[model samples]
Target chain A: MIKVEIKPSQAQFTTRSGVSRQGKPYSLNEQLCYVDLGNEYPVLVKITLDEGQPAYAPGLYTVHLSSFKVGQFGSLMIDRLRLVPAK
Target chain B: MIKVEIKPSQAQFTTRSGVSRQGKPYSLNEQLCYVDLGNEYPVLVKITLDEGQPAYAPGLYTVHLSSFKVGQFGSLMIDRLRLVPAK
Candidate 1:
């Protein structure tokens, strides 16, 4: 697993990254994040809707570094990164 | 949290829902799933990348659903769901 950050600039980044204490659920998002693996460049990853909220609402998460995609953008990027709370 | 299933036909779903023993990290997908929340129409959800293994790779997972999305197919379809281990 790799450590990833959800930048404040990211729309999904929020003070409340999960279900609200008031029992109200917030909308999920196709969140975007990055992980610097001490490499020359950080990898681009997407924390899709399914992986949203509760555990992956906002803030930093350690998730599996898996999968690759090359579309719209030319370079092969890490398209799917599991953004789950670190165990 | 809802119990969602990663259908056998789901793309990218491995044999389980988390990391496999093979050490090859299988990234999760925008996996389509359904649940009978007492509604005639099962909710549609997408599991976008998670370890999705140990069990979430191809079967059922209990997840905290944060929000709802009525999108696509010209119908009010469930556009999102959380698919995590029942634990």
Candidate 2:
């Protein structure tokens, strides 16, 4: 299972490597997480979006994901991120 | 908090009080739910939709809400339900 948490920005940053003021690129205190369940199976994911965030603004945003277990062969990267309305 | 479950209809129904060919109106075994948290506070709600049934179909649907604790002074009813793509 993939659990996700998005916290709204509390302050602004400059020279940001991402889009949108809400996206966490330039911020030095960006929050993130990684986990190991000790099993190889995927579980049901629970996603929680920060409701305190300002209402949807028109722009793109990045969803970054990195891997644990260093020296792994598989690649871990995110690109071409776009923000679209849910269906 | 309000918890919700949506199960797909296995069979068709006939005298429907509401909605689509895929909706539960015609069938007699319509699915629904209601809850009352102690202290009259809304808890964190968890919703599970039966994904095994079918994907979203274009059409109208009736979201019916009835109430218990009958003979109370206050009234409870639902109307003007509509289905739009989630955003």
Candidate 3:
């Protein structure tokens, strides 16, 4: 549906939840990571997980979210994740 | 706020909109980029830009979204694009 760029790295991946610094690392059912969508002045978003851990690479990509939300201070979470092309 | 890991790169940055394959590029008031929000097995998300582009690096970062639907695939446009210190 949408064509955009993505830069993925293992540094963003995780199995726990909650705050990693102050709050406790809340465990989750699936893994999580952050994805940079678009280019240049990109917005940073926390990946909420999906059925499986999708492969990722640093390059152009496409996407659509199963569910989404924005909380306090413009923080974000995706119920499901999807990206394509350089997957 | 929430503590999470992030991997940032200029490759994920851009200055256009719409689908990269078929759709026409829609000019916007931003320099867009895709960011990995959490740790590994993470989701790829295009960050929706805000007032000023926030600086990013690998390691822990904090967040919260101002509104909803930050990026194309579970992404964001953050108000608190604060990179936190590890204790």
TM-score of the first chain in candidate 2 relative to the native first chain: 0.19
lDDT of 3 at A60: 47
Q: Please tell me which predicted candidate would have the highest TM-score against the true structure.
A: 3
Candidate 2 Cα outliers beyond 4 Å, as residue runs? A1-28, A38-87, B1-20, B23-30, B35-87
Which ranges in model 3 have alpha carbons more than 4 Å from their true place? A7-27, A65-78, B1-68, B71-87
Lowest summed lDDT window (length 10), candidate 2 chain A: A67-76
User: Which 10 consecutive positions of candidate 3 chain B have the poorest summed lDDT?
Assistant: B14-23
Better of 2 and 3 by lDDT: 3
Better candidate by lDDT, 1 or 2: 1
Superior candidate under DockQ, 1 versus 2: 1
On residues A1-87, what C-alpha lDDT tens digit does candidate 3 reach at each position?
222345443354333343333333654445455665544566565555552554454444444443333342233433444555543
TM-scores, each model vs. reference: 0.21, 0.18, 0.31
Each prediction's DockQ against the real complex: 0.02, 0.01, 0.14
- Whichever of 1 and 2 has more TM-score, that candidate is 1
Pairs that clash in candidate 2: A1-A43, B1-B42, B1-B43, B13-B26, B13-B27, B14-B26, B16-B25
For candidate 1, the per-residue lDDT at A87 reads 36
Q: What is the C-alpha lDDT of each candidate?
A: 0.31, 0.21, 0.43
Query: lDDT, candidate 3, residue A11?
Result: 50
Q: For residues A34-62, what per-residue lDDT tens digits would candidate 2 score against the true structure?
A: 11111133112111122332222322222
